[model samples]
Each structure stands twice: as C-alpha cells, then as structure tokens.
Target: TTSVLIRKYAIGDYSKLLEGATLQLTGDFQARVFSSNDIGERIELSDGTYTLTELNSPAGYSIAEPITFKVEAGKVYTIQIENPNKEIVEPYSVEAYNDFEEFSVLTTQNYAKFYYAKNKNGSSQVVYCFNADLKSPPDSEDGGKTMTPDFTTGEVKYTHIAGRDLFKYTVKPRDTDPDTFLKHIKKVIEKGYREKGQAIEYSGLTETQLRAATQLAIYYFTDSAELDKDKLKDYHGFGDMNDSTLAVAKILVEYAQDSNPPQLTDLDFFIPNNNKYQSLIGTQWHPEDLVDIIRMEDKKEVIPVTHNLTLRKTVTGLAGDRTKDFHFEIELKNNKQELLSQTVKTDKTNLEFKDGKATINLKHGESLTLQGLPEGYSYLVKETDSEGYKVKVNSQEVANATVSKTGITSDETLAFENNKEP
Candidate 1:
C-alpha cells in the first residue's frame, strides 16, 4: 500500500491546501497519480521500491525534491511529498488594551469568545492552541519592561476550542442557591432573562437550576444581557444542572468581579490563508482559566465569552457483526475561516471494531462545521466503497457523501453503519 501526504510546513502545522497536486511513481513501472484527498492520500499497490515525485504543485508552491519509499503486500507504507514556495508567514501578535477600542465581540455570558474577522483572502484555516496557564499571562511578563515578538514552544496538549469552553477551577461544593449565584452575576449587570425556562426566578433556583441558567447566560449575554430568543429556546425546561455545569458557573463568577482577572496564557496557531500560512500567537491565560476575555482589534476592544460545542459519533454494523475497521477523519472549520481536522481510529486490539465512536469538542455558538467519511476508512476505497454502508445525522439517513454540519449547539452525532458483503 502506498500513501502520500502533501503538506505545507507553516506555523508548526500542516495544511492540506494541495488537494490536486500530481504525483508520479518510478523504479518498477511508470504510473502517474493525482491526489484528491485533503490532509493526505492513500493507495494500495504491489510490492516494489518506487520513487514518488511531484509532477506539479499547488500554486505558490514547488517541490525542491522527490521522495522514495518501498511498498510490500500486506504492509503499510507512508510517503510524504512536500514542495514549498515560501516559508511560513507571521500572522499577528496578541496584545491587551483597556476598554475603548473597536470590537468584534462582546458578551456577559460565562464563556469568553475571541473573534478573528476573516481577511481579504477569504481562506478559512484551522486554529488551535496549547501551553496555556490562566494564573499567568505572557503579557504580564513583558510588563514594567520592553516587549518583543516571541513564540511559545511545547506540546500542544489540547485543541484551541477545548479549554476555552470547559471552565477549570477550584470547586467549593455547597448547597448553593441559584438566587445567590444570580446575585453574584448581577454585580456586573447581566440581564435580558437570557437564560430561559420561566426565568428561574432569581429568588431560589436549585444548584442545578443555577448551573443551567449560568450555562445559558454564558452563551447569550454580555455586561448587560440582550437575550437572543432563538438561542434561548434550546435551554428552556432543563432539569437540575450537572456537576460539570456547576463548576463552569463558579469559574464565571470568580472572574466576573475580580479587579485583575487571570489572563490567557498559551500558544495558538491561527491559520489565515489556504492552510498555506498561519499566525502563531501566544498568551498568558488558558481559555479555561478565565470566565471571560477582553481581546483587542486595532484601536478597539471587547469582552466576550465562548461556549462549548459537543460532537458525538456512533458506529454500528448491519449484522450483529461486520463493524470492523471503524476509522475516519474529523474536520472542523470556524467562521474565522480556520480549519481543524483530526482522526478517530478504531482500537485494532479489539480485533473486531464492534462499537466504535468518537466525539470532538468545539467552541459554543461559533461558526463551525463537521466533515468526514460517511461509512468507512478513506484509504480502503480501493478494495471497497461504502456501497452497502449508510450514515445518519440525528437518525436521518443523510446518505454516504461528505456531510456538512454547522451552527452546532448541543450534542450532534454522526452515526455510521455497514453490514457485511456476501
């Protein structure tokens, strides 16, 4: 088997912008191949030592060299082909400014949202971050001294959306009242009854009630809540809140009234071009560390909260069997035109891939979409296609083609099914 991955080495990440780059094989026989797979390509071939060369490259890119690899029957081989036109470009710098700047985001909700308005290229790329610490922001490190452009380096532990929406804090478990939590939020002036469900009457909502309200409020309001009825419809009629929800509310309240809230601390890759170039920026606060954010855009700034988006994937087979090799790629693109793609693979150790699935975390209410294979692995298309396989979104057979889902709010599931071949 032969697999090819064409990537642009920019900003410490690989972009599959070369969707149609051509590759040719040499050594055993002459064969020309064109790539259609984003992120990378896969193919099955006879055993042989072959040289893989790029015949053409994506515009603004060129291959300085060809790559060689050996393929053997029943063996997996990966070949990487990269031709570059230029080095990675610097995107932007992360800085802080007090109130008084043009702003693209604002919210009184629990999560803090940082918006990156699209650029002229109109290219949406994947944005991710790591190495974040809320108690300390990099900006403060430069305080009382000269600041210079620097990039943070370390293992990217989580995706950019993960920590931002999931609030992390010290829990003070108590029979806390919803009214008490509401009073905490009121100091900042959150209103619009944006949290739905009979308004929960600020007097005495159960802990769960308060948690639910806080989550909803985090999604819709700013300093003063201007509720979005459409968005409110989703959280109406909620039972008590979960432990997780309570933790999130606490995170929000602690920072809401702090004189000097913890700052974002981390390294992020913000793709601004066709996966070709990215802007590397670092911060002192991890999105989870703070309840809200005050990001700046030129001469303006705004405080906004980001929300959590959940994605669920369920895998099943036709017979009580046949559900092996459950694997697929997961891709997410935000309104900022940032694109992120990850893979979910079956635990081959199980030997039968019977019940395999995965979930992706996302920023709440941000412009995001889900994309991946319909029923099986993208590589096996040679030996088999998803002819008998079926896919369902929310229980509806949306078919086998790549499905696009966006405006994601709650748990969205992508279900896959494939029986056996006679």
Candidate 2:
C-alpha cells in the first residue's frame, strides 16, 4: 500500500499555511480531506495514478490548480497546493456635509470641508481636508484609483486634505474654536432650510447660491488667505455676498457672540469636497476628486493597585489568659481623610466591617489577614485595653492603646502582644 500526503499553503509563501481548504483525490482511491495547519490526514491507498483537485477554498483565496501524480507500491507521495489571495472590497459610505440638499455649489480654494465616512458595522467617523486643488472620484472602477484620504489615528495639530496642508501658512489662533465654527455652520444651514419664514431670508436664493454664501462665511471666519479680499469688498466674483449670504453671515455672527463656542480639544475633523461633479476651479475632470478625514478612537485600561495587611494577637506571662478573647477596632482611610470601606478575609466568622471600621475578637496565637486593600490608605489597629494585660505592638509598648500607619503601599503585619502587668 502507498500513502498520500497533501498540504496547502498561500501563494508565494510555503511557510504560510492556508486553512479551511477542502481537497479531493480521485483515481484508485477517492477521499475528501480538509487542510488545517498546513497538512491534512495521510491515507493509505493502492499503488496507482491519482489526481488531486481542490473542492473548496477559504474565504478571500482563489482555488488551487489540480495536481496529477503517480504512486508506486509502498511509496509515500507528497503534494503541495498553493492558493492566491483575492482582492476584497471594504464596505464603506462617504458623504460630504449633511444629507439635506442644502449646499450644492459651495466652493473654496484653500479652505477645508468636513466629510463623514461610515463603516458597514455602523461605526461612523468625521475627517477634514485642507486642499481643494486635487481631483479624484469618490469611487472608481479600478478601486485603487479612487481618492481615499488617509487620516491620523492620534490627535494632530494639522493635516493634509485634497493635496493641501491645513494650518500651513497661518497658525490656528488659540481663541479660534474649530469645533464651534463647524457646529455653527451646520446649524445655520439647517435652520435656513427648516425655517423658511424666519428673519434670515434664505428663501430668496437657490440651494447652490445658499451653499456658496455659507462657504464664503466659513472662509471669512477661518481666515483663509486665498479668499480675495477685493472681491468680497467690491461684491464681484464668487466671493461676493448676496442677501441670502448676508443673512447666513448675520446668524453666524450672533451665534459666535451669544453662545458658548465649541472648543478644539482632542476632536476629529472631516473635510470633504462639497461638490463631486465640479472642481474648485469650475472645471470637470475624470475620476472627480473626493476627500475624507478620520480620527481614531482612543481606548484605555485601568488596573487597581492592591495591598495586604495581617493582624496577629499574642499573650505572654504566667497570669495572661491564653484562651481569653481580645477585642480590637480597625479603621482605614484614604489620603483625603475620607473613610474607606473594604472586606476582611479570615477563618473567624465573627469579623464584620461597618462604615470603614471593623470590630474583631481574637484569642491568643490567632491572626487575621485583609487582602486586596487599595493603595494610598492609612490604617489604625487599636486593641481595647484588657483588664489584666499590658498591650504592645510589634514588641514596642504603646502608651496609647493604638498602632497607626499612613500611606500603606505594600504587605504589612502588626503583631499585638499582651503581657500580665507585674
């Protein structure tokens, strides 16, 4: 009888094992085998010609080609198959600004816009872009040609968007609140569409014109250097403010002065192009440009610090009663002088802690230990004065009936010895 051994690996790397692949061997013996950890079960077969073909492949991997081989009597035949990795498209949705059809034609040369990207799992994030000069489609046939913006996982002071660097020429002023500005613009646009009969006359302008006005207001407040000051003052070119634009601007001004502006502490900003069809220069191009910004979520883990304390009782001298129970009071507190409540572990069942204090009765040679006590705490162990015995702690006689220590950080033990008064 001849034995056949089959193994599966990733294409281009034999050391990398591809699991979850099912293979079938046909010709003198027919058997279906599953590959896990590089190799499958070895089976004995009659000497003959056999063909091995992959029946099923693992996810994100292409099936391997069939291998034909001849097996001799009492000979071991080994076959290795490799699977190629398949290109997988990640599921994500990208949106520029809100879903409302409010701002359609807003354009800015060097300013940034917020864009949102949401994953299939319902986790959404916001990112911002500073460059409006580049052009690429939001989604492309090649997938690789698509303009997918890369963002920072940690907090960043400045970032590039659409091939332009934000906060490059001008420094973001300490008092300028980017979060407030974003919230204000969003609210202003939403209110303009929701309240048509309000004091802000957004009803007189088209959606495209309204978006343009809002963009102009954003450029003004953000202090974009590319904003043509002459065109804004002269009411010419794209920078000119119309009645609707003025109305939006007035509303934003009132918000800046009246409400608590948003701060820029540890926040992620998303800047995306407002228009996908038209570029900032009013020209159309292949694979229209789109941008995205993302701030990675932060996670933290906390492990509590713990300590252990042991309390022991001892009685000496001929008159000292070894069987008598000695009464003790234990108090624990933090650095703030506030009492702390914790559990005490011992073999004795009568020990109980109430309101940060525990009362315990211990016979001679008996001890109790308190485990898992939090760090940075002070402890007070006082043995109630016995009628015929003098109390001493750790071999040192105490003028008072208490032994106290502060800022406990490690394992400690307090030995209480009572001797008969001569």
Candidate 3:
C-alpha cells in the first residue's frame, strides 16, 4: 500500500456544471437500503441544482446501463429512497389506542404555535389561533377567557364564539395509557399550532430549554423548514428566526462598506425613495466596500424628496435634459461594468435604484432582491412607494471617495452624534 491515493476532481468556471446538466448511471446499487442521514453521495451547491441515478453498492456492482437524469440550477430537490420497509424507529410504539390515527401529530412536544381559521370552516384570508398544551385540560378556564378549539379527530377549528376566544377539550382517547396519550396529544398540539386558525407563536424556549425539549423528541421537518438548522440566535438571544433572515434581523453595530469608508452621517433616516430594492428589501455591507447610497426626507410627506444621494453623469444621446445628467445602465461584465456614456436615456419617470445602487426610472412599487454579495456581505432593496420623481446615483461620490455635503452632514439624523471630516 505504498502507492499514493490520488483523487481526481474537476474545478473550473464550472461551465460543465451549468444548470440542467445530467449524468447517467447504471448499477444495482438502487436496491440498497438508504438511511435518513445517508447521502450515499452528493455534490454541494446551494445555487440549487443537481440530479442523480446510481452506480454500484457495497459488494455488488454493475455498469454500462443507461440511467439518465437532469437537474436545473438554483433549484433544490431532495430525493429520498423509496424503501418499502420504512417505519417508525425505536422509542415509538404503534399508537392504536387513539380514535384518530393522527393523534400523534398533536403534542406538548410539538410546541408549534397553531392558528384557528377565520371562519367556522377556516375560510377567509384572515385567521385565528389557540394556545397548545400537552397536559390535562385545566379544571377551570383561565379568567373565563376562551381558548379556541384548534384540531379534532378529523375537523380543524378556525373560528370563535363572538367575543370569546381559545378552547380546550377533554381527551377521552380510548385504550391509550397516560404515557401514550401524552405522546399522541403532543402531535395534535403541534399540528394545531402550525395549521390554519391556530395562532403561530414563536418558540419561547431559550437555547438550553430548546436543547432539553429536543432531546426526547424525534426530529421532523415541515416543507422546506427544519428545526435546529434553520433556527438562529436572534438579536437578543439564541434560536429565533430561520437562518435565511438572520443577516437582516440580527441587530449589531453597522459598519462602513467602502474603501476609505464614509462616516455614517446620520441615523434620523430620510428617504428620497423608500421604494428602492435596497431601501425596501434592506441590504448589508462590510466596512470596506463602496455603495451608492440614496437618502430621502418625507417630513411633510411631500416631494421633490430631499436628504438623498443620486449618481449623476452627463450621458450622450440626450434630448430635453442633456445638462441635467442621468444614471448608469446596469449590465453584467467584469467588476460591475457599464458603458461610461449613455446610449439611451430612460424615459420612465417612476425612479428607483436598481441592484448595484445605480438609479433608474422604476415604476412605483417595483422591487428586486439579490444574493452572493461580494462573498463576505450581502444586501436587498424594495420599492415602498407608488409615487415617482428624480432618481440617480452619485457618480462623483463613487468615482472619487468624496465626502457628504456639509448641509447634509451637519443635520443630526443618521449622522453620528460625533461628526468628523471624511
């Protein structure tokens, strides 16, 4: 065994790994029993796209048979094995004592906040909710406050009796022991909290509490959501919102995102256009990246909205507003490339800035969200208005690390209390 173990792998622009790529495998390994945690083999990429068949399994092998599959980029597909022997693992017994087979779906263990339907049949766009419990029903109602019924044998409770709210029912589950009953009802509690009409309340358990609660529970997934993987420490503590929103909701000291970072001028935020994607959707940048910032002040809820920044460039092929200037048109190329001179002036007046923060004539309520923001940072923007007006990026500010206007800086807003020259 003196020979070296050489691993052959592919790495490039990944042109061969483009979306919709496919591979064909031929083997008897498909008969192998796969475990829930077993990937067997997998390629990692969240720009989601991939597909597979099979090659050979342990001991047995095959080849030359055409087993083809295709996958698209930016899409996730979790293909589980179609094993007929799949059954509830240990610590779980067959729950036969309950009237409803799904009694296991409700539980104190579920801890999922449930909702009540807006109407009796759970119709209407609006909704209602009931708190979850795995213990015995309270001997008396809490201050006569009615907790609405959440889920039953086959029916789901969605409405209330006029002014009264919240409800509970006695569990007369036939043939079930106290221990089994507790387990089954926990399932119901979970289903109620997560389903329609059951008010979805966030988990109150701290990191420690959550760990204890999870120890005795069999982990399960709902749709694309997971338990620990998705949960992240919130601004105040641990295990709150899903992983996706943590970058936005986690409150921390914001830093500059540019070379020769500009001093944060104000916090009494103004908005020239709150509707831009970065403004509406929100964005995050590190302390050493450049960004075209646009601010606005709607003090009287009136326009020519001020306290904002715009990118101005005297572009070519202009007619009415040649001297007034325009914003750069965005196109994909090396290092955020754009034609220095404009070939066409955008006529649409509902102005809003696009992804790279270059301004554009976006219609009111327009929006955009992007990911992969320069690796270490990312941002999003949304259009929050229906009104239209002047919109542009600060070409001068971006071209040379220029400081903010004195009047704009002197005002105390997002401008730090301690002002200094850039």
- Leading candidate by lDDT: 2
Instruction: Name the weakest run of 10 consecutive residues (lDDT summed) in model 3.
Output: 273-282
Q: What lDDT would candidate 3 get against the real structure? A: 0.20
Best by TM-score: 2
Candidate 1 vs candidate 2: the TM-score winner is 2
Between candidates 1 and 3, the one scoring higher on TM-score is 1
Give all TM-scores, in the order shown. Answer: 0.21, 0.34, 0.17
Greater-lDDT candidate between 1 and 3: 1
lDDT of each: 0.31, 0.46, 0.20
- All-Cα superposition RMSD per candidate: 22.1, 21.4, 24.9
lDDT of 1: 0.31
Candidate 3: stretches off by over 4 Å:
1-154, 157-322, 326-422
lDDT of 2 at 273: 24
Model 3 CA lDDT for position 158? 14
Q: In order, how many clashes per candidate?
A: 34, 17, 70
Give the alpha carbon lDDT tens digit for every residue of 1-422 in model 3. Answer: 01101011111110011121123222212322221111112322323222222222122121111222222242222223111111111101111111111111111232222111122122321111111112111111222123322233221111011110001111122223433322332332222222223433334323222221221121111111123433523311225343432222121101111123233211110011111100000011111111111100011112111222222222222222332322223321112242112111222332333333433322222222211111111111221221121222222212222223222211111110111122
